[PDB]
Design an enzyme around this catalytic site. Structure first.
Site, mmCIF file in Angstrom:
data_model
loop_
_atom_site.group_PDB
_atom_site.id
_atom_site.type_symbol
_atom_site.label_atom_id
_atom_site.label_comp_id
_atom_site.label_asym_id
_atom_site.label_seq_id
_atom_site.Cartn_x
_atom_site.Cartn_y
_atom_site.Cartn_z
ATOM 1 N N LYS A 17 -7.660 -0.025 -2.595
ATOM 2 C CA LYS A 17 -7.857 0.008 -1.146
ATOM 3 C C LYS A 17 -6.561 0.541 -0.568
ATOM 4 N N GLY A 18 -6.641 1.690 0.114
ATOM 5 C CA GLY A 18 -5.497 2.372 0.725
ATOM 6 C C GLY A 18 -5.034 1.691 1.996
ATOM 7 N N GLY A 21 -9.042 3.083 4.528
ATOM 8 C CA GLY A 21 -9.957 3.681 3.564
ATOM 9 C C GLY A 21 -9.836 3.212 2.124
ATOM 10 N N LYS A 36 -10.318 9.218 -1.714
ATOM 11 C CA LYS A 36 -10.051 8.203 -0.701
ATOM 12 C C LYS A 36 -11.005 8.470 0.430
ATOM 13 C CE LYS A 36 -5.848 7.847 0.996
ATOM 14 N NZ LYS A 36 -4.416 7.387 1.041
ATOM 15 N N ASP A 137 7.583 5.308 3.751
ATOM 16 C CA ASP A 137 6.944 4.141 3.157
ATOM 17 C C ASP A 137 7.044 4.183 1.633
ATOM 18 O OD1 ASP A 137 5.556 1.701 3.127
ATOM 19 O OD2 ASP A 137 3.568 2.701 3.145
HETATM 20 N N1 LIG Z 1 -5.411 3.138 -8.380
HETATM 21 C C1 LIG Z 1 -5.344 4.269 -8.538
HETATM 22 C C2 LIG Z 1 -5.246 5.687 -8.668
HETATM 23 C C3 LIG Z 1 -5.312 6.508 -9.765
HETATM 24 N N2 LIG Z 1 -5.078 7.818 -9.422
HETATM 25 C C4 LIG Z 1 -4.904 7.804 -8.098
HETATM 26 C C5 LIG Z 1 -4.636 8.822 -7.163
HETATM 27 C C6 LIG Z 1 -4.487 8.470 -5.854
HETATM 28 C C7 LIG Z 1 -4.639 7.103 -5.428
HETATM 29 C C8 LIG Z 1 -4.442 6.738 -4.044
HETATM 30 C C9 LIG Z 1 -4.734 7.440 -2.882
HETATM 31 C C10 LIG Z 1 -5.345 8.773 -2.682
HETATM 32 C C11 LIG Z 1 -6.526 9.115 -3.338
HETATM 33 C C12 LIG Z 1 -7.104 10.363 -3.149
HETATM 34 C C13 LIG Z 1 -6.464 11.277 -2.344
HETATM 35 F F1 LIG Z 1 -6.991 12.503 -2.167
HETATM 36 C C14 LIG Z 1 -5.281 10.970 -1.713
HETATM 37 CL CL1 LIG Z 1 -4.474 12.168 -0.760
HETATM 38 C C15 LIG Z 1 -4.729 9.711 -1.856
HETATM 39 N N3 LIG Z 1 -4.386 6.667 -1.781
HETATM 40 C C16 LIG Z 1 -3.924 5.547 -2.275
HETATM 41 N N4 LIG Z 1 -3.916 5.526 -3.631
HETATM 42 C C17 LIG Z 1 -3.386 4.401 -4.421
HETATM 43 C C18 LIG Z 1 -2.164 4.791 -5.215
HETATM 44 O O1 LIG Z 1 -1.012 4.922 -4.401
HETATM 45 N N5 LIG Z 1 -4.916 6.125 -6.279
HETATM 46 N N6 LIG Z 1 -5.013 6.516 -7.606
#
Ligand SMILES: N#Cc1cnc2ccc(-c3c(-c4ccc(F)c(Cl)c4)ncn3CCO)nn12
EC number: 2.7.11.30
Length: 306
Positions: A17-18, A21, A36, A137
């Site tokens: 969870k970002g 989103g 995301k 951040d």
């Molecule tokens: N858990 C896990 C995992 C494994 N590979 C990835 C790659 C990204 C992310 C991600 C994104 C995100 C996702 C898609 C996106 F296009 C963008 Cl611009 C951001 N936003 C938050 N997170 C959590 C990590 O900081 N998480 N993640």
């Protein structure tokens, strides 16, 4: 159809969870990607992230590889998507909680983090230039670890970009954005001059120092290592307020403890020195990401890291 688009992506697993989103693992033309998803009312946050990730010349081995911003209408509502590379290990926070690292492992993580931050911070003036970008951040939950044991900086949503020609920042920066635990002393006490972009780069360096401390704790030599902890775990409660952090960092002048065992190992002495030189209360005295990258590159060379 050769470019990656949302209609051709199938979500497979919820992975996080970002800030706003939800994050999923998905499959796009047989490959794994991270997606995301934002609701329609979160368009401002989704758009700002899409805009930062689309910055000219941003791409770098130590910055999360962005694929596309898109929309997907399921027939009832519209989802706003961001698609990026997927890294199975997840965040540096997850990785350090799960594992201990070798001296080589520690240097790989630190050097790659510094290299990504150096690129983010770097301004390239001219034709296909690149604006300097400050993260605002930086923390271990906002850095991902690749299969090769190197990092890439992620969660650029709160970033600020600098235009050299006009000496302006692209947004009206709000005070004290970011995770409170990692806020620089000048951000906590609001002494930061937010009109000078270099102030933001310096605040990122303080946060990077905290991340390096998190990594160093997990470095295992002769089976000796520290348990995983967030910086200030010993001084502040979980979810600390600005006032709780300010009392510790600004008034009492405390920093994460540098244990005696870090003086016995060359790699750990180098790391500890970098931390101290990221943690000065005076942002102007801190090392730059480029200087740290240079120091850690010389160290990885001496250790013979593949
Ligand atoms: N858990 C896990 C995992 C494994 N590979 C990835 C790659 C990204 C992310 C991600 C994104 C995100 C996702 C898609 C996106 F296009 C963008 Cl611009 C951001 N936003 C938050 N997170 C959590 C990590 O900081 N998480 N993640």
């Amino acid at each position: 159809g050769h470019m990656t688009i949302a209609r051709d992506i199938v979500l497979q697993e919820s992975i996080g969870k970002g800030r706003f989103g939800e994050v999923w693992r998905g499959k796009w033309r047989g490959e794994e990607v991270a997606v995301k998803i934002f609701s329609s009312r979160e368009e401002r946050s989704w758009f700002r992230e899409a805009e930062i990730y689309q910055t000219v010349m941003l791409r770098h081995e130590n910055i999360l590889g962005f694929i596309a911003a898109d929309n997907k209408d399921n027939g009832t509502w519209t989802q706003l998507w961001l698609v990026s590379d997927y890294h199975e290990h997840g965040s540096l926070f997850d990785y350090l909680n799960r594992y201990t690292v070798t001296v080589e492992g520690m240097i790989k993580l630190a050097l790659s983090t510094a290299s990504g931050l150096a690129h983010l911070h770097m301004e390239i003036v001219g034709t296909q230039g690149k604006p300097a970008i400050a993260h605002r951040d930086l923390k271990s939950k906002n850095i991902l670890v690749k299969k090769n044991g190197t990092c890439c900086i992620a969660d650029l949503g709160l970033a600020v970009r600098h235009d050299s020609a006009t000496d302006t920042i692209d947004i009206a920066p709000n005070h004290r954005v970011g995770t409170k635990r990692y806020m620089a002393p000048e951000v906590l006490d609001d002494s930061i001059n937010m009109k000078h972009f270099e102030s933001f780069k310096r605040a990122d360096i303080y946060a990077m120092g905290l991340v390096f401390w998190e990594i160093a704790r997990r470095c295992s030599i002769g089976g000796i290592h520290e348990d995983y902890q967030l910086p200030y775990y010993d001084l502040v409660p979980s979810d600390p307020s600005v006032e709780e952090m300010r009392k510790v960092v600004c008034e009492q002048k405390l920093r994460p403890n540098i244990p005696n065992r870090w003086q016995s190992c060359e790699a750990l002495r180098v790391m500890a020195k970098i931390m101290r030189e990221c943690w000065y209360a005076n942002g102007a005295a801190r090392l730059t990401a480029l200087r740290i990258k240079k120091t850690l590159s010389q160290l990885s060379q001496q250790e013979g890291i593949k």
